[PDB]
Amino acid sequence: VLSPADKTNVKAAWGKVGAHAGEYGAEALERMFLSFPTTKTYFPHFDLSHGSAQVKGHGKKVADALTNAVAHVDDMPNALSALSDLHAHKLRVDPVNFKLLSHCLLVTLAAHLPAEFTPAVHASLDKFLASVSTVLTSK
Amino acid sequence: VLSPADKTNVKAAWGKVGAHAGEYGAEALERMFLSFPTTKTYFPHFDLSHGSAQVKGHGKKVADALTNAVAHVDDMPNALSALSDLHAHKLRVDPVNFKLLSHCLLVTLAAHLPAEFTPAVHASLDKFLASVSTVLTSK
Amino acid sequence: VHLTPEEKSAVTALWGKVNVDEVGGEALGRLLVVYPWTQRFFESFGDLSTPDAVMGNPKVKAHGKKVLGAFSDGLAHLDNLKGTFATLSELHCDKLHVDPENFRLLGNVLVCVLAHHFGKEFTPPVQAAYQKVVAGVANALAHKYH
Amino acid sequence: VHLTPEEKSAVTALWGKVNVDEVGGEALGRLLVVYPWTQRFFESFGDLSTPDAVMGNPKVKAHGKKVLGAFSDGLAHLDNLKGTFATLSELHCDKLHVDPENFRLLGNVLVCVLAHHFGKEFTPPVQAAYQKVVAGVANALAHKYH
Ligand code: HEM
Ligand code: HEM
Ligand code: HEM
Ligand code: HEM
């Protein structure tokens, strides 16, 4: 479970990301595609080149889903239900891939929040993303 | 989440194990120790040789914990709370090790329930054990 | 992947009793049922909408045969799994983009199938030797990722 | 672990700017904080009861230095990681019994540390080259398990 300290650390980091969230989501996706090429096959109809409007667009979707999870942190299964259904059933996303994107999301925050990415906040974010990943692979 | 079909499949397999549960738990542990030697370091004060009273004794503990989880399948976090605390905090059991024991628990049921270990029941049991593992690594 | 002579003995003795026309399809089928995301790579096989559908699916059984064929090969070359599986690596890695974790999963599923079919005979030491084997194969099949 | 010349360039250029007395302890510390079970292997280090305690712990910093020392070595022998890490493998595998998954974790943590310290400079292509590297090392360190 996420402690109150975790919830506080995560809400904080989100605060500092501010309006760059969609942009950071896009960068996270690009990092994943380049570092872990197997993930690209889920996006055969995307142009995955740098600056791609489709990757930017999807990054915003992802960041919005994560913000919704933060905003309803105590009720994530319910909040992320439609996305759980989407990822497990229709898309059949391999569970391992959630660890990959999570790692790239952490890398992306690290590269943008010098002050905020302390060891404690790193820990809290990792736990947040693992909780999201758990929900997204529950169906 | 565990579907009603899963709950039905698991309660069934448990039924067939019957009173051999402790014995099967012991065998599962032995399979884990031999197949995955890294796991042995959590039991430095056990004699892990075949026929060991301590391994038999622990196998019963494990099987009893699993039976308690089955019996309170809809409320596993609560049921397994003290064990979650034990494994994560005191013992600091590496999360990977739960996948190893789960696999050995499945192997053990397979080797004992020819009729019951169908593909559907295999699926349901895997999900049950992953749910238990999730709880046990939540703290 | 060095098996002791006793580990080698355990593996080969059991393996000679394996029904090579069935065990492969049993293991693939179970994979697709237990870990449904793997069905992503087999959309062309037809009806995978149920357990019965998957197991009784002729394309599953057929394909499982070749998979088990591959395993039988590695059991013959435990000395050189890398070379044995090189080409299959390129295929699953460079062309299919199957995450290697799934190779470990299929190996574990195969182990459950052997336990199911052999019961008592699939002793804890026999299982331990087989885990050495399926780990060696998964790793070799994954080499075109490293 | 074949890096293209461009991947090689990306890695070495950044690595020359790394503070070898600090980055190692930063990565180990973070490991023990983020994945607390790893503290099982470092009970002798003293106070690990907090993040601040771990990071400011002299034994963490000290040990992290040798870890980063090991990484620097592999960056020198990407051609032969197996041989380079053989002895460390025996130690972590045969003597310590650390599950190899933890090698992958420490590698990813190191990657987060590099991103933290280098910001924009740690571009997605630079990260991709480093993921190739830390995977090659984790795999070599794990060879005494295969
Ligand atoms: C933190 C974890 C994740 C979050 C929050 C997330 C979020 C989302 C959201 C909000 C959508 C809906 C997009 C839309 O309706 O237009 C979506 C779709 C999708 N997701 Fe994810 N996702 C995650 C992990 C993954 C992973 C790991 C993969 C595969 C590597 C993946 C693959 C896809 C694909 C292929 C689509 C359909 C995109 C399209 O066709 O436009 N997701 N995801
Ligand atoms: C299905 C997963 C698991 C279940 C249901 C389970 C169950 C239990 C139970 C009920 C106890 C209490 C024993 C007692 O109070 O005497 C216990 C203790 C313990 N468990 Fe587990 N466990 C699981 C997984 C693991 C794994 C994967 C490991 C490490 C590989 C582990 C290591 C230990 C250790 C070292 C103890 C203390 C034993 C002693 O000192 O007597 N457990 N477990
Ligand atoms: C675990 C060990 C595995 C072995 C030994 C193995 C072996 C094989 C063999 C022998 C073939 C036939 C190649 C040919 O027709 O020339 C094949 C093809 C194929 N494999 Fe596997 N496989 C393994 C795991 C997996 C997994 C886990 C997946 C997906 C989850 C997968 C996906 C596929 C697909 C989609 C094909 C057919 C693609 C094509 O013919 O272009 N394999 N594999
Ligand atoms: C990920 C890559 C890793 C590298 C490159 C690495 C490298 C090293 C090095 C250079 C030493 C010093 C050996 C000596 O004093 O001669 C060492 C010792 C040690 N390592 Fe690691 N390590 C790694 C991961 C890990 C992990 C993940 C753990 C535990 C979670 C671990 C546990 C230990 C322990 C407990 C020692 C000291 C034991 C002793 O001196 O007897 N290592 N390692």
UniProtKB/Swiss-Prot annotation, chains A, B:
Changing G15R: In Ottawa/Siam. The modification Phosphoserine is found at S3, S35, S49, S102, S124, S131, S138. The modification Phosphotyrosine is found at Y24. Changing A82D: In Garden State. Changing K16M: In Harbin; slightly unstable. Changing D47A: In Cordele; unstable. InterPro entries: Globin, Globin-like_sf, Globin/Proto, Hemoglobin_a-typ, Hemoglobin_oxygen_transport, Hemoglobin_pi. One of its GO terms (cellular component) is extracellular region. Changing L109R: In Suan-Dok; unstable; causes alpha-thalassemia. Changing L125R: In Plasencia; family with moderate microcytosis and hypochromia. Changing G18D: In Al-Ain Abu Dhabi. Changing T41S: In Miyano; O(2) affinity up. Changing V62M: In Evans; unstable. Changing D6G: In Swan River. Changing P44L: In Milledgeville; O(2) affinity up and. Keywords: Acetylation, Disease variant, Glycation, Glycoprotein, Heme, Hereditary hemolytic anemia, Iron, Metal-binding, Oxygen transport, Phosphoprotein, Transport. The modification N6-acetyllysine is found at K16. Changing L125P: In Quong Sze; causes alpha-thalassemia. Residues 1-139 form the Globin domain. The record marks K11, K56, K60, K90, K99 as: Not glycated. Changing N78K: In Stanleyville-2. It is linked to Heinz body anemias: Form of non-spherocytic hemolytic anemia of Dacie type 1. After splenectomy, which has little benefit, basophilic inclusions called Heinz bodies are demonstrable in the erythrocytes. Before splenectomy, diffuse or punctate basophilia may be evident. Most of these cases are probably instances of hemoglobinopathy. The hemoglobin demonstrates heat lability. Heinz bodies are observed also with the Ivemark syndrome (asplenia with cardiovascular anomalies) and with glutathione peroxidase deficiency. Belongs to the globin family. This is Hemoglobin subunit alpha. The lineage of its organism: Eukaryota, Metazoa, Chordata, Craniata, Vertebrata. The gene is HBA1.
Curated annotation (Swiss-Prot), chains C, D:
CDD domains: Hb-beta-like. Changing V98G: In Nottingham; unstable. Changing H116L: In Vexin; increased oxygen affinity. Changing V126E: In Hofu; unstable. Changing N139D: In Geelong; unstable. Changing V34F: In Pitie-Salpetriere; O(2) affinity up. One molecule of 2,3-bisphosphoglycerate can bind to two beta chains per hemoglobin tetramer. Changing L68P: In Mizuho; unstable. Changing P36T: In Linkoping/Finlandia; O(2) affinity up. Changing S89N: In Creteil; O(2) affinity up. Involved in oxygen transport from the lung to the various peripheral tissues. LVV-hemorphin-7 potentiates the activity of bradykinin, causing a decrease in blood pressure. Changing E90D: In Pierre-Benite; O(2) affinity up. This is Hemoglobin subunit beta. Changing L31P: In Yokohama; unstable. Changing V111A: In Stanmore; O(2) affinity down; unstable. Changing E121G: In St Francis. Changing N102Y: In St Mande; O(2) affinity down. Changing H146P: In York; O(2) affinity up. Changing H117P: In Saitama; unstable. The gene is HBB.
